[PDB]
Amino acid sequence: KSYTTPKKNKHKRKKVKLAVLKYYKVDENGKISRLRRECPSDECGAGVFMASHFDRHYCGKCCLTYCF
Amino acid sequence: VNTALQEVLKTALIHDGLARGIREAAKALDKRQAHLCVLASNCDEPMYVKLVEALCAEHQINLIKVDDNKKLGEWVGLCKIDREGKPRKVVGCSCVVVKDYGKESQAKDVIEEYFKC
Ligand SMILES: [Zn+2]
């Protein structure tokens, strides 16, 4: 059957090259500094980092929002 | 000790202990369950190798250095299809962290003593 409204194209989620490398910072010595925050929730305790948006941080696993 | 490393990682993947990937390695190191890790060299990795080495050197983990990525993929054995010889499509890998509960192996004991001494 013919249509009038054009079909709603699916969301093409873009890829990120070496997205893991954007969490920490590179130093020549044997020390670690973490850039973004980490979710203090129960299921994701100390391994899963949080999002870094333009106005608030977010974790999707437990739906935790940290507004400014 | 390379054969000890390959056997212990095969046991780890059999026992569903190890993790593979930069994201998985970071998760294991942050969860403080990591025991060993591997890293490749001579690649277009300006800050990748420095980042993972600092992660590995943060607190009490063993480091293994290798050259090639697809060879490391052969070391872990993720594409064992076409068993009658060479795997048809070898995949590459750089960072693999070994967490093992079935460490009752002479290979594990030898590599642990090698890192300790
Ligand atoms: Zn969370």
Q: Which residues of B touch A31 (CB under 8 A)?
A: 54, 57-58
Q: What residues does B20 pair with on adjacent strands?
A: B96
Q: Which residues of A touch B31 (CB under 8 A)?
A: 45-47
Q: Is A16 on the interface with B (CB under 8 A)?
A: no
Gap from CA of B48 to ligand 1 centroid (Å) = 26
Evaluate whether B72 touches B94 at the Cβ level (below 8 Å): yes
C-beta atoms of B22 and A32 within 8 A: no
The structure was resolved experimentally with cryo-EM
CA–CA–CA angle A11, A15, A16 (5° rounding): 140
Gap from CA of B92 to ligand 1 centroid (Å) = 31
Nearest CB among B27, B31, B58 relative to A32 is that of B58
Query: What is the per-residue burial (b if ≥16 Cβ within 10 Å, else e) of B72-84?
Result: bbbbbeeeeeeee
Q: What residues does B19 pair with on adjacent strands?
A: B97
Biggest CA-to-CA distance, chain B: 43
Q: Residue A34 — φ and ψ, nearest 5°?
A: -95, 130
Three-state secondary structure call for residue B24: helix
Three-state secondary structure call for residue B16: coil
C-beta atoms of A46 and B58 within 8 A: no
Q: Which residues of A touch B43 (CB under 8 A)?
A: none
C-beta atoms of B57 and A23 within 8 A: no
- Residue B55 corresponds to which tokens in the numbers above? 């992660």
